[PDB]
Amino acid sequence: MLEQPYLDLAKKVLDEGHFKPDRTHTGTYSIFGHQMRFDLSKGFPLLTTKKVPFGLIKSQLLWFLHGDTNIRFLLQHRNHIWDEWAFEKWVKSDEYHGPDMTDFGHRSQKAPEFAAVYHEEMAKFDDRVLHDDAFAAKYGDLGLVYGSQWRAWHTSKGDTIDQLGDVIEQIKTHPYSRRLIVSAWNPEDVPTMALPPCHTLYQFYVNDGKLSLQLYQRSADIFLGVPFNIASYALLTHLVAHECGLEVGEFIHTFGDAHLYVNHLDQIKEQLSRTPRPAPTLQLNPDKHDIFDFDMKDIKLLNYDPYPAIKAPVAV
Amino acid sequence: MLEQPYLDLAKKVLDEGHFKPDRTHTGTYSIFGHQMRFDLSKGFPLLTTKKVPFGLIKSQLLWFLHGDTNIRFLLQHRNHIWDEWAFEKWVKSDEYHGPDMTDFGHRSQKAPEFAAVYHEEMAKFDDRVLHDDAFAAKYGDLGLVYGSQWRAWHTSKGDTIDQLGDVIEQIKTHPYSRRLIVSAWNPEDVPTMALPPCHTLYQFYVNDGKLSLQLYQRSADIFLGVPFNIASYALLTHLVAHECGLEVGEFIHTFGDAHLYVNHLDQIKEQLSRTPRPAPTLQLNPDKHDIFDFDMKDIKLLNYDPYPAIKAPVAV
Ligand SMILES: O=c1ccn([C@H]2C[C@H](O)[C@@H](COP(=O)(O)O)O2)c(=O)[nH]1
Ligand SMILES: O=c1ccn([C@H]2C[C@H](O)[C@@H](COP(=O)(O)O)O2)c(=O)[nH]1
C-alpha cells in the first residue's frame, strides 16, 4: 500500500530504536541508515493515516522553486512554517525594542503569560513583513535556506549558480547520467548556521522513460517531519518530470539518523492502528510547462480522504 | 556472513537490472537506490570470494587522509590507481612532445602496436613523477580529488577548510550529532571536472558507544569498484574510531545508480558460486593515535584467505 513504507519505519524505530541523548534533552529513539521506496505510479504519498495539509507543502515548495529566501511569500499564503527562523533575528535585533523574548522555543511552551506576549509579537512581525517593503528585506530575507542552495549557490570568485536549473536541463539533454545531483550542503557555510539543511542531497535517475529521485536526509523526526518531507520531494519528482516530459517512477528516501522524540510515542502508537486508505492522485496543470512559473492552482490533489490529524509537542 | 550483502547486490542487479545506455556504450544493468549494512564488529569486509589487494586500498586511503593530491605518494608504493588521470594531462600538454596518444582509454584496449607505446610512455611519466621534484609538482599534482575535498575545501573569500579534521573533533566533543557529514560534492567545481566524485557524502553517528558510517555513492561498478570501495570506508570507519577511542559499529553503503557493465556478467556469475569464507580481522597499531600520521605498518590485516582473483575489462 503506498504509505506502508512509512508505517514500517515508525514501527521499526519503536521496536529497535535505542535511546539517544539530543539537541534538547527530549530524547529520541533513532536508527542510523534506512531506505524506503515509493512507486509513484500508484498514487500520491500523502499520508492517509493523519490529516496532512497539502497546502503548506506545495507553497513551501513553490517558494523553494522560485529561488526564494523570503518569508513574505509564505506569509502571503499563510504558510507559517519558517516565521520562527525569521522572527528570531528580529527579536534578537537593535531596532526591536520590546520584551526580553530570549529564546521562546520552550519558554513559550510551558509558560502562558509569555506564550501570549510572543504570539502577538510574532503576529506584530508577520504584519510587518507583509506590509513594510523595507523591513521585509532585511528581516524577512532569511539568508541561506533551500531556495538559495538549490537555485543560487554562491561561488568562489563572484557569481551564483542555479544548480537546479542546470540539473533539469542535463535531464533534458543527458538522461542516463549518473551525475545528476543537487546539493544543499555548503561546507563553508555549515559551522556557523542555523539548521544546516536536513535534506542534504538529492539525485535523479532516468531509466526506460521514467524519472526517479532519491533523498539523503541526515536527520529526521518520524512524526512531524517525515510525512511532510515525503510529499515535498514526491511533489518535486512529479513537477520536474512534467517539465522533462517523462513518466513518473520512484521516490527513494534514505535516512541517516531517523528518529522519534519521546513525547510522541503515544501518538504514533495511535496512528499505527489506523488502516491506511487509498492514496490521492495528483493532476498537474496541462499547459504550463516551465515549473518555475508554477503557482498553487497549477497543482490540485484529488481523493485525499484522510483520517483526522494528530496533535504533538514540536521541537525545542 | 559478512560479504553476503555484496553478493546479494550482484545477484539482485542481474536479476532485475534494466539495460541502461552509458558513458561509453558498454551498457550496464543498474538499479537506482540500494542500502547494504556491514556489522563491522564481526570482521573486516574484504571480499573473500575474489582476491583483493588490501595494499592498494590502505595506501589509497592514507593518501586521502594526508590531504593529498599527489601522484607521487602513490607511485612511491606502486599504487597506480590514478596514474591515468595524471598521465592524461601530461600527454595532452605542450612540454609533451611525443606520440599522438589521443585518448588511449580503449585505443590501447584493442590495438597492441599502441597498447605498448602508451605503456612505456606512461612508465616514462611515472619515473618522471618520482624523480623530478619540479615536474611532479605541475603534472603529478592532480588538482581536486578526495584528499583535497575532505581536508582543504576551498572557500569563497580566501581560505581552505579541513572538513574532516573538523568532523573528527565534533565526534570527540559532540558525539550525538546528527550534523556530522563530510562532503566531496563541490557544486562550482562540478560542471567542468574529470570524475565528479562517486563517493559524494559520508556521515558518522555515535550511539551507546560505537561509531558508524554511511556512504552515499551516486554511481558504482558492482564488479570492480564496490569491493574496493567497501574496504576503503570500512577502513576509514575503523581509523576514525580508534582516533575517537570508540568501538566499531556498522558501515552502511547507500547507492544511487549501482551497476554491472555487460562484459562482466560472466565473471560475477562465476564468483557467485564461490562459498564465502571467514572474514579477516584488522588490528590497528596500539600506540599511534592521531590517524593522520598513519602509515602502512600501523595497519596489518589477518587471515585474509581469499579465493583467487578474477580478471575483467575495465572502464572506457
Ligand atoms: O524537514 C524536516 C526538518 C527537520 N526535521 C527534524 C530533524 C530533527 O528532528 C530536527 C533537526 O535537528 P538537527 O538534525 O539539525 O540537529 O528537525 C525533520 O525531520 N524533517
Ligand atoms: O570508487 C569507485 C569509482 C568509480 N566507480 C565507477 C562508477 C561508474 O561505473 C564509473 C563512473 O562514471 P560516472 O559515474 O562518473 O558517469 O566508475 C565505482 O564503482 N567505484
From Swiss-Prot, chains A, B:
One of its GO terms (cellular component) is cytosol. InterPro entries: Thymidate_synth/dCMP_Mease, Thymidate_synth/dCMP_Mease_dom, Thymidate_synth/dCMP_Mease_sf, Thymidylate_synthase, Thymidylate_synthase_AS. (6R)-5,10-methylene-5,6,7,8-tetrahydrofolate binds at D221, A315. Gene3D superfamilies: Thymidylate synthase/dCMP hydroxymethylase domain. DUMP binds at R23, R178, R179, R218, S219, A220, D221, N229, H259, L260, Y261. Pfam families: Thymidylat_synt. GO terms for molecular function: thymidylate synthase activity. It is found in: Cytoplasm. It is an enzyme of class 2 (transferase). Pathway: Pyrimidine metabolism; dTTP biosynthesis. CDD domains: TS_Pyrimidine_HMase. Keywords: Cytoplasm, Methyltransferase, Nucleotide biosynthesis, Transferase. The keyword Electron transport does not apply. The active site is at C198. It catalyses: dUMP + (6R)-5,10-methylene-5,6,7,8-tetrahydrofolate = 7,8-dihydrofolate + dTMP. NCBIfam families: PRK01827.1-2, thym_sym. Homodimer. Belongs to the thymidylate synthase family. Bacterial-type ThyA subfamily. This is Thymidylate synthase. The gene is thyA.
